JSON list of C-alpha atoms and ligand atoms in Angstrom, two decimals:
[
{"chain": "A", "resi": 1, "resn": "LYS", "atom": "CA", "xyz": [-122.11, 145.20, -174.86]},
{"chain": "A", "resi": 2, "resn": "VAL", "atom": "CA", "xyz": [-119.95, 142.24, -176.27]},
{"chain": "A", "resi": 3, "resn": "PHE", "atom": "CA", "xyz": [-118.72, 140.32, -173.05]},
{"chain": "A", "resi": 4, "resn": "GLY", "atom": "CA", "xyz": [-115.45, 138.47, -172.80]},
{"chain": "A", "resi": 5, "resn": "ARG", "atom": "CA", "xyz": [-115.96, 134.96, -171.78]},
{"chain": "A", "resi": 6, "resn": "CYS", "atom": "CA", "xyz": [-114.48, 135.28, -168.15]},
{"chain": "A", "resi": 7, "resn": "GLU", "atom": "CA", "xyz": [-116.14, 138.76, -167.78]},
{"chain": "A", "resi": 8, "resn": "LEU", "atom": "CA", "xyz": [-119.61, 137.04, -168.47]},
{"chain": "A", "resi": 9, "resn": "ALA", "atom": "CA", "xyz": [-118.79, 134.06, -166.25]},
{"chain": "A", "resi": 10, "resn": "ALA", "atom": "CA", "xyz": [-118.20, 136.46, -163.26]},
{"chain": "A", "resi": 11, "resn": "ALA", "atom": "CA", "xyz": [-121.27, 138.37, -164.04]},
{"chain": "A", "resi": 12, "resn": "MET", "atom": "CA", "xyz": [-123.30, 135.37, -164.21]},
{"chain": "A", "resi": 13, "resn": "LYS", "atom": "CA", "xyz": [-121.93, 133.95, -160.96]},
{"chain": "A", "resi": 14, "resn": "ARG", "atom": "CA", "xyz": [-122.60, 137.28, -159.21]},
{"chain": "A", "resi": 15, "resn": "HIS", "atom": "CA", "xyz": [-126.30, 136.91, -160.39]},
{"chain": "A", "resi": 16, "resn": "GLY", "atom": "CA", "xyz": [-126.68, 133.55, -158.87]},
{"chain": "A", "resi": 17, "resn": "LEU", "atom": "CA", "xyz": [-126.46, 131.29, -161.97]},
{"chain": "A", "resi": 18, "resn": "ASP", "atom": "CA", "xyz": [-123.51, 129.14, -160.91]},
{"chain": "A", "resi": 19, "resn": "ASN", "atom": "CA", "xyz": [-125.19, 125.67, -160.15]},
{"chain": "A", "resi": 20, "resn": "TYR", "atom": "CA", "xyz": [-128.69, 127.16, -160.54]},
{"chain": "A", "resi": 21, "resn": "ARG", "atom": "CA", "xyz": [-130.98, 124.18, -160.76]},
{"chain": "A", "resi": 22, "resn": "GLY", "atom": "CA", "xyz": [-127.73, 122.16, -160.92]},
{"chain": "A", "resi": 23, "resn": "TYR", "atom": "CA", "xyz": [-126.43, 123.70, -164.10]},
{"chain": "A", "resi": 24, "resn": "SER", "atom": "CA", "xyz": [-122.48, 124.65, -163.49]},
{"chain": "A", "resi": 25, "resn": "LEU", "atom": "CA", "xyz": [-121.49, 128.10, -164.63]},
{"chain": "A", "resi": 26, "resn": "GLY", "atom": "CA", "xyz": [-119.71, 126.62, -167.65]},
{"chain": "A", "resi": 27, "resn": "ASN", "atom": "CA", "xyz": [-123.23, 125.50, -169.07]},
{"chain": "A", "resi": 28, "resn": "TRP", "atom": "CA", "xyz": [-124.50, 129.15, -168.89]},
{"chain": "A", "resi": 29, "resn": "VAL", "atom": "CA", "xyz": [-121.39, 130.49, -170.47]},
{"chain": "A", "resi": 30, "resn": "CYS", "atom": "CA", "xyz": [-121.54, 127.89, -173.20]},
{"chain": "A", "resi": 31, "resn": "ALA", "atom": "CA", "xyz": [-125.24, 128.66, -173.84]},
{"chain": "A", "resi": 32, "resn": "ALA", "atom": "CA", "xyz": [-124.59, 132.46, -174.20]},
{"chain": "A", "resi": 33, "resn": "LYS", "atom": "CA", "xyz": [-121.63, 131.82, -176.60]},
{"chain": "A", "resi": 34, "resn": "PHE", "atom": "CA", "xyz": [-123.73, 129.84, -179.09]},
{"chain": "A", "resi": 35, "resn": "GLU", "atom": "CA", "xyz": [-126.94, 131.82, -178.49]},
{"chain": "A", "resi": 36, "resn": "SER", "atom": "CA", "xyz": [-125.56, 135.40, -178.88]},
{"chain": "A", "resi": 37, "resn": "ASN", "atom": "CA", "xyz": [-121.77, 135.41, -179.22]},
{"chain": "A", "resi": 38, "resn": "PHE", "atom": "CA", "xyz": [-121.72, 137.09, -175.92]},
{"chain": "A", "resi": 39, "resn": "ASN", "atom": "CA", "xyz": [-123.45, 140.13, -177.42]},
{"chain": "A", "resi": 40, "resn": "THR", "atom": "CA", "xyz": [-126.25, 141.62, -175.11]},
{"chain": "A", "resi": 41, "resn": "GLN", "atom": "CA", "xyz": [-127.85, 143.35, -178.28]},
{"chain": "A", "resi": 42, "resn": "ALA", "atom": "CA", "xyz": [-128.34, 140.16, -180.33]},
{"chain": "A", "resi": 43, "resn": "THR", "atom": "CA", "xyz": [-131.87, 139.78, -181.87]},
{"chain": "A", "resi": 44, "resn": "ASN", "atom": "CA", "xyz": [-133.12, 137.07, -184.14]},
{"chain": "A", "resi": 45, "resn": "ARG", "atom": "CA", "xyz": [-136.46, 136.61, -185.77]},
{"chain": "A", "resi": 46, "resn": "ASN", "atom": "CA", "xyz": [-138.04, 133.20, -185.50]},
{"chain": "A", "resi": 47, "resn": "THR", "atom": "CA", "xyz": [-140.01, 131.44, -188.32]},
{"chain": "A", "resi": 48, "resn": "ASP", "atom": "CA", "xyz": [-143.30, 131.77, -186.49]},
{"chain": "A", "resi": 49, "resn": "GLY", "atom": "CA", "xyz": [-142.92, 135.66, -186.10]},
{"chain": "A", "resi": 50, "resn": "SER", "atom": "CA", "xyz": [-141.53, 135.59, -182.49]},
{"chain": "A", "resi": 51, "resn": "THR", "atom": "CA", "xyz": [-138.08, 137.09, -181.65]},
{"chain": "A", "resi": 52, "resn": "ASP", "atom": "CA", "xyz": [-135.24, 136.06, -179.42]},
{"chain": "A", "resi": 53, "resn": "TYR", "atom": "CA", "xyz": [-133.52, 138.76, -177.31]},
{"chain": "A", "resi": 54, "resn": "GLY", "atom": "CA", "xyz": [-130.17, 139.35, -175.64]},
{"chain": "A", "resi": 55, "resn": "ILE", "atom": "CA", "xyz": [-127.31, 137.29, -174.43]},
{"chain": "A", "resi": 56, "resn": "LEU", "atom": "CA", "xyz": [-129.51, 134.32, -173.78]},
{"chain": "A", "resi": 57, "resn": "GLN", "atom": "CA", "xyz": [-131.82, 134.71, -176.80]},
{"chain": "A", "resi": 58, "resn": "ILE", "atom": "CA", "xyz": [-135.06, 134.73, -174.71]},
{"chain": "A", "resi": 59, "resn": "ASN", "atom": "CA", "xyz": [-138.18, 134.20, -176.91]},
{"chain": "A", "resi": 60, "resn": "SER", "atom": "CA", "xyz": [-141.12, 136.74, -176.98]},
{"chain": "A", "resi": 61, "resn": "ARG", "atom": "CA", "xyz": [-143.41, 133.72, -177.79]},
{"chain": "A", "resi": 62, "resn": "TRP", "atom": "CA", "xyz": [-143.40, 133.03, -173.81]},
{"chain": "A", "resi": 63, "resn": "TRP", "atom": "CA", "xyz": [-141.28, 135.26, -171.96]},
{"chain": "A", "resi": 64, "resn": "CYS", "atom": "CA", "xyz": [-141.38, 138.93, -172.80]},
{"chain": "A", "resi": 65, "resn": "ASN", "atom": "CA", "xyz": [-143.61, 141.52, -174.67]},
{"chain": "A", "resi": 66, "resn": "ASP", "atom": "CA", "xyz": [-142.19, 143.01, -177.87]},
{"chain": "A", "resi": 67, "resn": "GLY", "atom": "CA", "xyz": [-145.39, 144.38, -179.12]},
{"chain": "A", "resi": 68, "resn": "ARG", "atom": "CA", "xyz": [-145.50, 142.36, -182.32]},
{"chain": "A", "resi": 69, "resn": "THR", "atom": "CA", "xyz": [-145.73, 138.65, -181.23]},
{"chain": "A", "resi": 70, "resn": "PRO", "atom": "CA", "xyz": [-149.52, 138.03, -181.26]},
{"chain": "A", "resi": 71, "resn": "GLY", "atom": "CA", "xyz": [-151.05, 135.28, -178.96]},
{"chain": "A", "resi": 72, "resn": "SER", "atom": "CA", "xyz": [-147.88, 135.17, -177.06]},
{"chain": "A", "resi": 73, "resn": "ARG", "atom": "CA", "xyz": [-147.13, 135.33, -173.25]},
{"chain": "A", "resi": 74, "resn": "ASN", "atom": "CA", "xyz": [-145.11, 137.59, -171.19]},
{"chain": "A", "resi": 75, "resn": "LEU", "atom": "CA", "xyz": [-144.09, 135.16, -168.36]},
{"chain": "A", "resi": 76, "resn": "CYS", "atom": "CA", "xyz": [-140.98, 137.34, -167.14]},
{"chain": "A", "resi": 77, "resn": "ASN", "atom": "CA", "xyz": [-143.34, 140.45, -167.11]},
{"chain": "A", "resi": 78, "resn": "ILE", "atom": "CA", "xyz": [-140.70, 142.53, -168.98]},
{"chain": "A", "resi": 79, "resn": "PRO", "atom": "CA", "xyz": [-140.54, 144.36, -172.28]},
{"chain": "A", "resi": 80, "resn": "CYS", "atom": "CA", "xyz": [-138.13, 142.38, -174.58]},
{"chain": "A", "resi": 81, "resn": "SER", "atom": "CA", "xyz": [-135.93, 145.50, -174.97]},
{"chain": "A", "resi": 82, "resn": "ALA", "atom": "CA", "xyz": [-135.04, 145.05, -171.27]},
{"chain": "A", "resi": 83, "resn": "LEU", "atom": "CA", "xyz": [-133.17, 141.93, -172.26]},
{"chain": "A", "resi": 84, "resn": "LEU", "atom": "CA", "xyz": [-130.75, 143.99, -174.46]},
{"chain": "A", "resi": 85, "resn": "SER", "atom": "CA", "xyz": [-129.25, 146.04, -171.64]},
{"chain": "A", "resi": 86, "resn": "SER", "atom": "CA", "xyz": [-125.38, 146.08, -171.05]},
{"chain": "A", "resi": 87, "resn": "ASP", "atom": "CA", "xyz": [-126.67, 145.07, -167.46]},
{"chain": "A", "resi": 88, "resn": "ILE", "atom": "CA", "xyz": [-127.54, 141.30, -167.64]},
{"chain": "A", "resi": 89, "resn": "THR", "atom": "CA", "xyz": [-129.98, 141.43, -164.44]},
{"chain": "A", "resi": 90, "resn": "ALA", "atom": "CA", "xyz": [-133.14, 141.19, -166.49]},
{"chain": "A", "resi": 91, "resn": "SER", "atom": "CA", "xyz": [-131.85, 138.29, -168.77]},
{"chain": "A", "resi": 92, "resn": "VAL", "atom": "CA", "xyz": [-130.64, 136.28, -165.76]},
{"chain": "A", "resi": 93, "resn": "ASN", "atom": "CA", "xyz": [-133.81, 136.80, -163.65]},
{"chain": "A", "resi": 94, "resn": "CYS", "atom": "CA", "xyz": [-135.87, 135.64, -166.63]},
{"chain": "A", "resi": 95, "resn": "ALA", "atom": "CA", "xyz": [-133.56, 132.71, -167.47]},
{"chain": "A", "resi": 96, "resn": "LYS", "atom": "CA", "xyz": [-133.94, 131.41, -163.86]},
{"chain": "A", "resi": 97, "resn": "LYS", "atom": "CA", "xyz": [-137.81, 131.37, -164.47]},
{"chain": "A", "resi": 98, "resn": "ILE", "atom": "CA", "xyz": [-137.27, 129.46, -167.88]},
{"chain": "A", "resi": 99, "resn": "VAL", "atom": "CA", "xyz": [-134.81, 126.92, -166.58]},
{"chain": "A", "resi": 100, "resn": "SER", "atom": "CA", "xyz": [-137.22, 126.23, -163.61]},
{"chain": "A", "resi": 101, "resn": "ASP", "atom": "CA", "xyz": [-140.25, 125.56, -165.82]},
{"chain": "A", "resi": 102, "resn": "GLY", "atom": "CA", "xyz": [-139.66, 121.66, -166.14]},
{"chain": "A", "resi": 103, "resn": "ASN", "atom": "CA", "xyz": [-137.46, 121.45, -169.41]},
{"chain": "A", "resi": 104, "resn": "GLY", "atom": "CA", "xyz": [-134.17, 122.75, -167.76]},
{"chain": "A", "resi": 105, "resn": "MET", "atom": "CA", "xyz": [-131.77, 124.18, -170.17]},
{"chain": "A", "resi": 106, "resn": "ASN", "atom": "CA", "xyz": [-133.21, 122.19, -173.09]},
{"chain": "A", "resi": 107, "resn": "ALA", "atom": "CA", "xyz": [-135.31, 125.39, -173.83]},
{"chain": "A", "resi": 108, "resn": "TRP", "atom": "CA", "xyz": [-131.99, 126.83, -175.13]},
{"chain": "A", "resi": 109, "resn": "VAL", "atom": "CA", "xyz": [-131.65, 125.11, -178.56]},
{"chain": "A", "resi": 110, "resn": "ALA", "atom": "CA", "xyz": [-127.95, 126.01, -178.87]},
{"chain": "A", "resi": 111, "resn": "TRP", "atom": "CA", "xyz": [-127.34, 124.57, -175.36]},
{"chain": "A", "resi": 112, "resn": "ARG", "atom": "CA", "xyz": [-129.07, 121.26, -176.20]},
{"chain": "A", "resi": 113, "resn": "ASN", "atom": "CA", "xyz": [-127.13, 120.86, -179.54]},
{"chain": "A", "resi": 114, "resn": "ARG", "atom": "CA", "xyz": [-123.78, 122.48, -178.68]},
{"chain": "A", "resi": 115, "resn": "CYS", "atom": "CA", "xyz": [-122.98, 122.35, -174.91]},
{"chain": "A", "resi": 116, "resn": "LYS", "atom": "CA", "xyz": [-125.20, 119.41, -173.38]},
{"chain": "A", "resi": 117, "resn": "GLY", "atom": "CA", "xyz": [-122.82, 116.54, -172.59]},
{"chain": "A", "resi": 118, "resn": "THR", "atom": "CA", "xyz": [-119.69, 118.40, -173.59]},
{"chain": "A", "resi": 119, "resn": "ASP", "atom": "CA", "xyz": [-116.81, 119.38, -171.17]},
{"chain": "A", "resi": 120, "resn": "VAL", "atom": "CA", "xyz": [-118.33, 122.87, -170.29]},
{"chain": "A", "resi": 121, "resn": "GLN", "atom": "CA", "xyz": [-115.97, 123.50, -167.57]},
{"chain": "A", "resi": 122, "resn": "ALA", "atom": "CA", "xyz": [-113.59, 124.60, -170.22]},
{"chain": "A", "resi": 123, "resn": "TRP", "atom": "CA", "xyz": [-115.80, 127.71, -170.68]},
{"chain": "A", "resi": 124, "resn": "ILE", "atom": "CA", "xyz": [-114.61, 129.01, -167.25]},
{"chain": "A", "resi": 125, "resn": "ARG", "atom": "CA", "xyz": [-111.06, 127.77, -167.42]},
{"chain": "A", "resi": 126, "resn": "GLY", "atom": "CA", "xyz": [-108.46, 130.51, -166.48]},
{"chain": "A", "resi": 127, "resn": "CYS", "atom": "CA", "xyz": [-111.12, 132.95, -165.19]},
{"chain": "A", "resi": 128, "resn": "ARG", "atom": "CA", "xyz": [-110.67, 134.72, -161.85]},
{"chain": "A", "resi": 129, "resn": "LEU", "atom": "CA", "xyz": [-114.60, 135.06, -161.54]},
{"chain": "B", "resi": 1, "resn": "LIG", "atom": "O1", "xyz": [-140.07, 130.24, -182.14]},
{"chain": "B", "resi": 1, "resn": "LIG", "atom": "V1", "xyz": [-141.83, 129.48, -181.67]},
{"chain": "B", "resi": 1, "resn": "LIG", "atom": "O2", "xyz": [-143.50, 128.65, -181.11]},
{"chain": "B", "resi": 1, "resn": "LIG", "atom": "O3", "xyz": [-142.24, 130.89, -180.91]},
{"chain": "B", "resi": 1, "resn": "LIG", "atom": "O4", "xyz": [-141.06, 128.81, -180.14]},
{"chain": "B", "resi": 2, "resn": "LIG", "atom": "O1", "xyz": [-125.88, 146.10, -160.47]},
{"chain": "B", "resi": 2, "resn": "LIG", "atom": "V1", "xyz": [-126.60, 145.82, -162.27]},
{"chain": "B", "resi": 2, "resn": "LIG", "atom": "O2", "xyz": [-126.60, 144.17, -162.00]},
{"chain": "B", "resi": 2, "resn": "LIG", "atom": "O3", "xyz": [-128.55, 145.80, -161.81]},
{"chain": "B", "resi": 2, "resn": "LIG", "atom": "O4", "xyz": [-124.74, 145.70, -162.61]},
{"chain": "B", "resi": 3, "resn": "LIG", "atom": "O1", "xyz": [-132.94, 130.86, -177.85]},
{"chain": "B", "resi": 3, "resn": "LIG", "atom": "V1", "xyz": [-132.05, 129.41, -178.59]},
{"chain": "B", "resi": 3, "resn": "LIG", "atom": "O2", "xyz": [-133.65, 128.38, -178.55]},
{"chain": "B", "resi": 3, "resn": "LIG", "atom": "O3", "xyz": [-132.48, 130.17, -180.35]},
{"chain": "B", "resi": 3, "resn": "LIG", "atom": "O4", "xyz": [-131.32, 128.10, -179.28]},
{"chain": "B", "resi": 4, "resn": "LIG", "atom": "NA1", "xyz": [-144.78, 137.71, -175.61]}
]
């Protein structure tokens, strides 16, 4: 599914990401924009052989099992394919574990380089929610 901006903002707020560990909803929307272009089906292979999955590009090196990332962890206790669903529940629940692990949203390279320190409220401007 390719979400609209406000449709994804509403879904993320319903799943408890608004101000989760102090990150406003616009941070999560901005991160999803630059990680996946709001596409739940997005996949991208990393140089080290891991893959990033779904709307928030969650990495098989640590967080999910994709059957082909040797010596990796599955800290969200999910198959990586769960992260590609039209239903963002699995991605949000796993993202809450990632952002809680000590590095905050710096785990998301696109958030650090494109969202951090910008006017992220712009991402939810005009949205009903
Ligand atoms: O892309 V690599 O060590 O898995 O983060
Ligand atoms: O109700 V689903 O969040 O598991 O749309
Ligand atoms: O999941 V992202 O680390 O590719 O920036
Ligand atoms: Na893994």
